[PDB]
Ligand binder design. Structure first.
Ligand SMILES: *SCCNC(=O)CCNC(=O)[C@H](O)C(C)(C)COP(=O)(O)OP(=O)(O)OC[C@H]1O[C@@H](n2cnc3c(N)ncnc32)[C@H](O)[C@@H]1OP(=O)(O)O
Ligand SMILES: NC(=O)c1ccc[n+]([C@@H]2O[C@H](COP(=O)([O-])OP(=O)(O)OC[C@H]3O[C@@H](n4cnc5c(N)ncnc54)[C@H](OP(=O)(O)O)[C@@H]3O)[C@@H](O)[C@H]2O)c1
Ligand SMILES: CC(C)(CO)C(=O)C(=O)O
Lengths: 300, 303
């Protein structure tokens, strides 16, 4: 399959490298430093598995359409990234987002009806230009957005699985994007404001209790929007924590490193969607403000 | 007036010092370290004003009943304080709480019917034993609890004003206690979680906005309980932030000392009352949990 990865950072590099190793026609689109490193010395994966590949790399999407465009930029980059890559979206090109946050698939739908949504629990970190840590193995779920099925989604899933990307197909992609966002709202909210490891959210019984309330808040918004869940967000929440007990969440890591966070597309979107249908998401709103305020305080 | 200040922390020390300077017969009842410092080197106030006075100080309640007993301890110690002082609560002794939070007056009423509720928006910090930083010059309002009037309440307000404690009398003290509780829910919640001075909550427009939402939540709970306000809690909020903008709030101070915090008596009380009338108080509930979580994380550590 011809695949362009738009956003050759941590998760984009991991997916691109695995897809390339399996023999797919892969092009990574990203930062100059990343492109130059890869073109010079290839792309190195270490951690859960160790190997080197040399996919194509460029700072700008080719005009030639791929079978698949994977969106792997941060959510605050999606709108512009699509504007800068629209030349490659052909009549038959599908766009898959494996991004956290909400609304990315909607942005892609502006350009084509051929959109899939995805969630991955793989963990990755680009530690140097051209060197990505496969920090943890996990499942990937993809589906026609917002719901239903398509032969090409099935193909993508097979390609993924053959490359060692464990992948399941869902006919409720939107449910999964929202379930992930709700889980992120709890972990990336509480863990960041308190600066604690994910496991602490379960160990302090009061944090465990408020986690449920935050999750229920997101679930109720979803339900009012007509969204249903294939897997319960609460189940996903506790499973996610159980597996990442000693980790600091990615939002907290962003702030520590002086990088922009994605909370506008997590808490922010839950809040915005709630308002549109006559609800509030007060806990999400407070977490949103606290995390953004913490960021401003640190920056300055 | 013969006045015993029960609790020799920052606010108790500030009130005791001001009342002593004015010539009142003042005794501070508190912990050994503070008591010893006051008896040895006097009580020194600095910041908003700078002066030194030497009130009496003791770890034990005097036998003689005072005209006025001022509760100034943190709210988690109100029961301990009243037990320490129970023998000096005479038939004509009034107890005034100027404490943060809700419910302190109700605890005092278990000992005597002579209870007044008080709010003060002064900001203070005990920086060394015997040395209090007056970080924000606020206002004080006192009244017969929960409502109504009494000649002695008026007399106390007169004494306070004479001593430079700017004070008004209210016939709706319970409403004032709730207004201050709502103000503290914003300041001691947001300021503590973010670990910033009070002024930052007004400076950041996004914090400003969420502050309104938190205040409204508390006001709606109060309305359901039949509480009426003489002063808009939002006005009290902005006034208080301006008057104490350089202060780190008392809850944050406790966190930094690895102490227990008062939040059970602020956010916790708002949430508990809310739930009793079928209301969530979601913002207060989250702040409650966040601050108590920080309390537990920092407990026993001095930062
Ligand atoms: S019953 C009579 C005999 N006394 C006893 O048996 C002991 C129990 N009774 C008492 O301690 C006092 O009678 C009461 C009034 C209950 C408490 O006295 P204080 O109010 O003076 O003492 P506190 O500990 O409650 O707080 C006073 C200030 O001291 C500072 N502070 C307390 N704890 C710490 C720690 N761990 N580290 C640094 N500083 C600490 C605080 O600044 C506190 O002032 P705040 O303004 O509240 O912060
Ligand atoms: N890392 C993980 O383990 C993981 C796992 C699951 C999901 N996710 C989600 O996947 C998404 C990406 O995460 P990430 O950790 O991989 O972020 P990342 O390391 O910052 O990688 C994103 C890359 O895309 C680049 N980029 C931005 N705009 C671009 C554009 N027009 N063209 C080309 N490149 C562009 C970015 O560069 P600049 O920074 O300079 O803009 C960055 O290098 C997020 O939504 C994340 O939540 C990540
Ligand atoms: C008035 C104010 C908010 C001063 O900070 C206070 O009551 C406190 O610190 O608890």
């Amino acid at each position: 399959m011809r695949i362009y990865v738009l956003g050759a950072g941590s998760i984009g590099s991991l997916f691109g490298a695995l897809l390339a190793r399996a023999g797919n026609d892969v092009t990574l689109i990203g930062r100059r430093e990343q492109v130059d490193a890869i073109n010079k010395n290839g792309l190195h994966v270490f951690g859960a598995e160790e190997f080197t590949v040399k996919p194509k790399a460029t700072i700008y999407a080719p005009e030639e359409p791929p079978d698949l465009l994977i969106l792997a930029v941060k959510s605050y980059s999606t709108k512009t990234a699509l504007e800068c890559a629209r030349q490659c979206i052909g009549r038959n090109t599908w766009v898959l987002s494996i991004q956290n946050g909400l609304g990315n698939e909607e942005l892609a739908l502006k350009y084509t009806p051929n959109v899939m949504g995805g969630v991955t629990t793989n963990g990755a970190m680009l530690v140097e230009w051209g060197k990505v840590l496969w920090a943890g193995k996990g499942i990937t779920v993809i589906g026609r957005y917002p719901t239903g099925r398509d032969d090409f989604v099935d193909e993508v899933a097979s390609v993924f699985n053959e490359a060692g990307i464990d992948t399941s197909v869902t006919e409720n992609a939107i449910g999964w994007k929202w379930a992930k966002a709700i889980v992120n709202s709890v972990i990336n909210g509480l863990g960041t404001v308190l600066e604690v490891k994910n496991g602490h959210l379960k160990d302090d019984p009061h944090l465990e209790g408020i986690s449920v309330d935050i999750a229920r808040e997101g679930c109720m918004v979803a339900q009012q929007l007509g969204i249903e869940f294939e897997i319960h967000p609460l189940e996903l929440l506790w499973d996610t924590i159980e597996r990442t007990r000693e980790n600091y969440n990615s939002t907290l890591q962003d702030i520590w490193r002086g990088r922009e966070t994605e909370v506008d597309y997590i808490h922010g979107k839950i809040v915005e969607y709630a308002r549109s249908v006559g609800m509030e998401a007060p806990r999400n709103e407070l977490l949103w403000v606290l995390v953004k305020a913490k960021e401003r305080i640190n920056r300055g």
